[PDB]
Amino acid sequence: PPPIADEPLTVNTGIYLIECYSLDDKAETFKVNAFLSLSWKDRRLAFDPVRSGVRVKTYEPEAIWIPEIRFVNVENARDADVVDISVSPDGTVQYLERFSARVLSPLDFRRYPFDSQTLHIYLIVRSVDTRNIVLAVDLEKVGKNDDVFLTGWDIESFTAVVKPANFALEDRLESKLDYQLRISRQYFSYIPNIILPMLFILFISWTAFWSTSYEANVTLVVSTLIAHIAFNILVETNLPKTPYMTYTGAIIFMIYLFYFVAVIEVTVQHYLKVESQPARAASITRASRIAFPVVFLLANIILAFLFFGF
Template identity: 40%
Template structure:
């Protein structure tokens, strides 16, 4: 009996010192592993993150406020070898995680007006450690627009993604395979032409650091045909009608034609003004309307001068001016619009 007790005591004394440290070591190892996963995959080198923004559709578009609201997908892809696994041992070809369970890059939309709305987020890891981040989002974005060529303008709508960590920690790359738009994406009054994406570096003068950015540009072209039919052609007809005074010798008729043309142009402008962008600079269509006003006013002045020449018995001079004005005024009108077109292209 005494020998049995000695054997049991010897067994426990040998077992406990050896195995208790092993258990403690395993727990510490698990804590260290969890802690490391919460850090960047490679702390010695910058983590490269491929970014893609895919447009589903536009919700709103305000060219005056230079803003637009869209919903789409945000794609992020990076490599994390710590998450690699053997699919033959796990019986799965990919693993899914929740936000907070693994490291994810700290990024933001730089030109968003408020916090973006997120419908859902998917995190999937492939056997080689490639991590795929997919987010369905909605956001109101600001993007500078130039309406000087309105209504023949083209705009670039930008969505800018920036890493909150400096470029020494995170480098953003453009994933062109995940940049684009759905076939049924639609923007009223505009045609979606193409997309382009590129990375760039922003240098912060305040923080004296450099940050990596991803820029997605959506190129859109305005449908200008409605403005040609509803604005340019009617005003062109009005100005052409006013030029009939160059063939008429009746002061009363010429006065009616000239004043009627001016009143028609003013009334027409009142009707279409709501369709024109309210900006602080002169657009192409504003320039055209202004030229029409100037030439109608010149016609009114011409009518008065011609009548004065007739009263002064200077009919020959009046006829000579008529013959010159018949080709000179339309020519100057055409040149004025060519100058306007050239100015809008600068």
Template identity: 30%
Template sequence: MKNLLIIFLIFIASIHYVSAEGYPKSRPNESDGPTIVKIAFYIIDIENIDNKKQSFTADVIIRLKWKDSRLSGIEKAIPLNAIWNPRIQIYNLRDVDARFPEVVKILKGDTIQYTQRYYATLSSPLDFSEFPFDVQTLPITLLSFGFTPQEVVMDFEVAGGADKFSVSDWNIENIGAKTSIIKASFFQDGLEVIERPRLDYEFKANRHIQYYWWKVLSPLMVILFLSWAVFWIDPSQVGAQVGVSGTSILTLIAFLYKLDNILPPVSYLTHLDNFVFTTLGLVFFAYLEALVSTTFALKGKKDFALKLDYIFRIAYPIIFTIILLIFWA
């Protein structure tokens, strides 16, 4: 499906527009090798990272520069489609609002400059296996749909941006840019392969883990302390022991439904899922121990039942501490 999208965009990009003002439409200095396009980024803001849709919203300015001596001396702004241009587009684009006019400026030294501001929603495959300790890579991927790597070379020039972004639950850091070549074929046999130059400007996103301490860890600790209380109740008090341990299980199950608003909707278990289900197993173990100790107490072995409760008064918090260190340290 992705290859078909690339092929469609290449077809659209290959359409030549006729310039009413007679500006050259062919690539400048074709015999001298590939045209070098210098690319700069300025990140105004990253507003949102959507776990469910696996996308992020960015407000970014992208500047392209290339040489074309045929346009030397022109002082007015020229429509982008009226001249030759590298036809560079955002590859992982889902939705966009372009804010600047589609025009280029002729700078000194025969340099053509095209600057555009995009308010865009961009796709990004997110891996939630380590959630909420996951580190995500957010790319802005540019592709020259109209030309091969032998015709256009994308060269990262410079990047800048705001010191702080408005996305509240993530810490965003700049990684940098890398260039590569993307390949797509019309058919699965791979006999006809199209190559296009690609540039990825990437960010690293880390979650603010304090939110999950308060929203997940703290309520779970309260539920675990509630289940721990069963070891302090006289084992002959069957109703009290079973009632406390059963209430702990039901409370935890209700809490799991609340977690649906926090956990990403994926088909595999995340790090947080494993912690929650381990905690559920520990609470269920307290319930089983309550049944065993009350059974021994009813059979006249109350001393053994008391000894069993005493052992787990000490073992239960130790086991939970070990689990806590494994998952949250």
């Protein structure tokens, strides 16, 4: 029973994030518990203050006509319970629910551990024979308690795109809004657990430049390369099959090389010290002691600059 209008009836939205949780890097989703505030003029139940009752009349959903506000990027029918409905005298309705659905927003892992993110929540609404334009009321949209959680994420700002996008979707126009949740990752536990440990094994790898033994120079360069896959695999896991290249996937792969040419040098400091030419053997080996850490620290400024500095 939609509200007999004279033009496209505006509906006024608003979201108060109560809870934020379980951002799932692999699935690229997150759950959110929050308020959903709607409002519109339904002159059809304007109601004479003095003549009867009181300031505002409480209705049940079945009584009033209510605009079907569906979320766009959600796995399931959103999970809301209605909190209150209050009809002003002019025929203005005040709606409030408290939904909790899991949202499907994509993430950009280009700078993986040192990445910032922009999540999205949507709210389309399809028309009937009066058009429906949605729009935000920023007193109900300042939504985000001083308690929002999001484990392992710093939260930067909950804002929203005032101007909606009105679509042509199947002989009926809908109107879609963009609620933006901006976050930065708490990279850190990434260092004592992944970055640093990954680095130390790399250095011991090439302790084998200050050694003559092949027997102990494979037990060296090789034993570490194993340990590196332990880190490659640990990381390749809490992260999706990105069609692009990650920052960490970069240096985690750049590393694979300094083990290959490390295992190259130790191999050649042998078919060139068994060929009785240690003239050249402890010449190469001596150089590698600089070649490597420098090409590295250089390739990391080269790699690093390539990702953040552009």
